[PDB]
């Protein structure tokens, strides 16, 4: 099947400046009908797509013309001349010569803005929670920038994982920073086994990895 | 302007089967093929095939061969795709497009029972900090199926709130938490509930968030 | 797929010598600013290079009012006898230039009067007694075959497109139009070449007259629903396929434009050129028109192929 391969994965912008993002076919996408079927569109967070170019380089109707897409054979480029606050979102491109149809894995269009490091919380189960039999345990990375960020739970300074998930915010309309929520889960009988519970942080805003903890039963 | 409109989220037991319409309007039905896409909770798409609602032709992804069938009503201007023997991995927003893209239909496919969720509180142990500002939040667990919606004071608190996307366990069941920032001053004189609402399990709770000690 | 002013630059051209060369000089000029203003490209190309380009539609304006006889008509000299061709002819280039620069009505309404009045035969059709010297610039006319239904339908064309301005100075006008219109829509179904096809057919669409048994024949003359040509000079075939363009949009069959649209950019026909006015005027504005009526219409899902593979 044809791969396609986009780069960069994450693209910061600055309103006002241009944008450029590849795509990279594994195989010519000229069809024999003479056409090339090399798609682009937009997908902001929760939606259906927006359909922005068709046929390589022509503009959907109504798409602003500070995009453009151009290329051929294998290689492809979709440029934005002056980047708009609408225009942050993911960007896919597709073939539509090959069988199967085939999409690139997006590239995040996102606001840049500068560092700022993640205030941390760490958050203890409830004693209503340990009563059914399980503690979870709550790490809070609030308001960083970039994107990019690492969890790491200890549990008596044992690395863990596997048994913690994470989810992280849509990038604020307001301050341009992202949030990021782990739970670490565990049987009541595990929790009370183990004392030191820390939650440690790596992200590019702090000098080194800051550690939250608790002790299991001190405040 | 052209519009797609598609059939509702559904919840599948594994072995199932689901056939999800698309309503077209704004151009003519007929002249143009649509495209069936499939896009995985966090991941990319998938294309499953494609019909011409002029002849009925059809051509899919042979990964789905004998699983899926798309047909079209041209007298209603509606799409279908049927999908069976339905498999946790099929878990995903089925989308039409022609070339516009319909809203997409979240397609669940699981043996989980519908569940209200628990609401347990996010609290420092202690109301003493040093910091200028301090976190609070709802951890709302163990639910089946999306979605829930959080609020904090009734909605007449939305500075600094962090509701964040759920995610499955290996339970089957979703966990979600809600977060807000405040002034560490405000800590027991100020109050704090999330009200949280499942409407699949007809579930309302409000928790007010207090911590253990002062 | 507007085409790229950068490569239209040749077509700002300074209009110099007789009555037939100065219209040949006008022709790339007026129609590379009517494009380049329908597609929005002087902010790009240079605003600074439009107000240029007006100047040289001036001086081609000016200098053809020496070729105006006294009967309003024009030849290539003043002592030659008037060409009913090169008369319609400077009808099209001015009415269409008149939101460019100002055109005298006196002029442009003097010459419609003279071919009704002077070169309309009683049965409709229109009569050239002088031919134009240049024969290379007046396109698929050239042909000996059909001459009678291909000068009819070009007078019958720049008639109409002078009538919003004319009318209301030349009361013959909407009879003459009437008339030239009976004797294509009596003619047309015995017409054997695809380029009369075109130009009688655009000039029946715009008097909603391209109908029925008419309407079938024109759209069944393209080959592959995409060109009308003939076997001969490859000019003349795209001349023939942008009145076929214009034919459609008047009839608003925007399904039918796209694959027309597409054939004539893979031609990668820019204009200028020996024998070049009628295709570089034609195809600017035949695409102009279709960028104001259905810019980037598309008649099915051109994100992917037609194939529809069934293993």
């Given at each position: 099947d044809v791969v396609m391969t986009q780069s960069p994965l994450s693209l910061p912008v600055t309103l006002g400046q241009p944008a450029s993002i590849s795509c990279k076919s594994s195989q010519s996408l000229l069809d024999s009908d003479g056409k090339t079927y090399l798609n682009w569109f937009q997908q902001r967070p929760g939606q259906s797509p927006r359909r922005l170019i068709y046929l390589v380089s022509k503009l959907d109707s109504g798409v602003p013309d500070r995009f453009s897409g151009s290329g051929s054979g294998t290689d492809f480029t979709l440029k934005i001349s002056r980047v708009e606050a609408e225009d942050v979102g993911v960007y896919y491109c597709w073939q539509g010569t090959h069988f199967p149809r085939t999409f690139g894995g997006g590239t995040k269009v996102e606001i840049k803005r500068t560092v700022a490091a993640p205030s941390v919380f760490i958050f203890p189960p409830?004693?209503?929670?340990?009563?059914?039999?399980?503690?979870?345990?709550?790490?809070?990375?609030?308001?960083?920038?970039?994107?990019?960020?690492?969890?790491?739970?200890?549990?008596?300074?044992?690395?863990?994982?596997?048994?913690?998930?994470?989810?992280?915010?849509?990038?604020?309309?307001?301050?341009?920073?992202?949030?990021?929520?782990?739970?670490?889960?565990?049987?009541?009988?595990?929790?009370?086994?183990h004392k030191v519970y820390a939650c440690e942080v790596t992200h590019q805003g702090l000098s080194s990895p800051v550690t939250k903890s608790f002790n299991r039963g001190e405040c | 302007?052209?519009?797609?409109?598609?059939?509702?989220?559904?919840?599948?037991?594994?072995?199932?089967?689901?056939?999800?319409?698309?309503?077209?309007?704004?151009?003519?039905?007929?002249?143009?093929?649509?495209?069936?896409?499939?896009?995985?909770?966090?991941?990319?798409?998938?294309?499953?095939?494609?019909?011409?609602?002029?002849?009925?032709?059809?051509?899919?992804?042979?990964?789905?061969?004998?699983?899926?069938?798309?047909?079209?009503?041209?007298?209603?201007?509606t799409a279908y795709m049927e999908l069976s023997s339905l498999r946790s991995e099929d878990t995903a927003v089925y989308f039409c497009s022609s070339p516009y893209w319909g809203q997409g239909t979240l397609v669940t496919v699981s043996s989980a029972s519908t569940k209200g969720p628990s609401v347990f509180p996010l609290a420092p142990c202690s109301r003493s900090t040093s910091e200028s500002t301090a976190a609070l939040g709802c951890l709302v667990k163990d639910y089946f199926p999306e979605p829930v919606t959080v609020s904090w004071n009734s909605g007449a608190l939305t500075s600094g709130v962090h509701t964040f996307p759920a995610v499955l366990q290996s339970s089957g069941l979703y966990s979600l938490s809600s977060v807000v920032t405040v002034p560490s001053s405000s800590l027991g004189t100020k109050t704090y509930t999330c009200n949280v609402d499942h409407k699949p399990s007809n579930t309302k709770v409000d928790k007010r968030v207090e911590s253990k000690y002062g | 797929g507007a085409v790229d002013a950068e490569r239209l630059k040749h077509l700002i051209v300074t209009p110099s010598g007789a009555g037939e060369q100065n219209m040949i000089g006008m022709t790339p000029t007026v129609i590379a600013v009517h494009y380049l203003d329908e597609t929005e490209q002087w902010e790009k190309f240079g605003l600074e290079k439009r107000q240029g380009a007006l100047e040289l539609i001036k001086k081609g304006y000016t200098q053809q009012l020496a070729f105006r006889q006294p009967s309003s008509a024009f030849a290539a000299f003043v002592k030659r006898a008037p060409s009913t061709w090169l008369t319609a002819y400077v009808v099209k280039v001015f009415s269409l230039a008149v939101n460019l620069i100002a055109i005298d009505s006196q002029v442009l309404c003097g010459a419609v009067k003279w071919l009704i009045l002077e070169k309309q035969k009683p049965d409709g059709v229109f009569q050239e007694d002088a031919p134009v010297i240049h024969q290379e610039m007046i396109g698929g006319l050239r042909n000996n075959n059909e001459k009678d239904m291909a000068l009819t339908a070009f007078v019958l064309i720049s008639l109409q497109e002078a009538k919003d301005i004319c009318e209301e100075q030349v009361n013959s006008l909407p009879g003459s139009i009437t008339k030239a219109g009976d004797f294509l829509e009596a003619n047309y179904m015995n017409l054997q070449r695809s380029y009369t096809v075109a130009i009688a057919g655009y000039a029946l669409a715009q008097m909603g007259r391209l109908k029925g048994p008419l309407l079938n024949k024109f759209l069944t003359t393209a080959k592959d629903k995409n060109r009308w040509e003939d076997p001969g000079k490859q000019l003349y075939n795209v001349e023939a396929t942008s009145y076929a363009l214009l034919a459609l949009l008047q009839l608003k069959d925007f399904d039918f434009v796209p694959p027309v649209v597409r054939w004539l950019n893979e031609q990668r026909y820019y204009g200028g050129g020996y024998g070049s006015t009628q295709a570089t005027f034609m195809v600017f504005q035949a695409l102009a028109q279709y960028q104001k009526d259905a810019p980037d219409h598309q008649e099915l899902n051109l994100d992917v192929s037609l194939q529809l593979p069934s293993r």
């Open positions: 409830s004693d209503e929670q340990l009563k059914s039999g399980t503690a979870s345990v709550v790490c809070l990375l609030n308001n960083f920038y970039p994107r990019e960020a690492k969890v790491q739970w200890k549990v008596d300074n044992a690395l863990q994982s596997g048994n913690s998930q994470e989810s992280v915010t849509e990038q604020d309309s307001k301050d341009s920073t992202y949030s990021l929520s782990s739970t670490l889960t565990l049987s009541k009988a595990d929790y009370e086994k | 302007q052209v519009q797609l409109v598609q059939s509702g989220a559904e919840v599948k037991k594994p072995g199932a089967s689901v056939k999800v319409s698309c309503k077209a309007s704004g151009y003519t039905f007929t002249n143009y093929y649509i495209n069936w896409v499939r896009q995985a909770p966090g991941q990319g798409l998938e294309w499953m095939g494609v019909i011409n609602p002029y002849s009925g032709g059809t051509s899919y992804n042979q990964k789905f061969k004998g699983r899926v069938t798309m047909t079209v009503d041209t007298s209603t201007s | -």
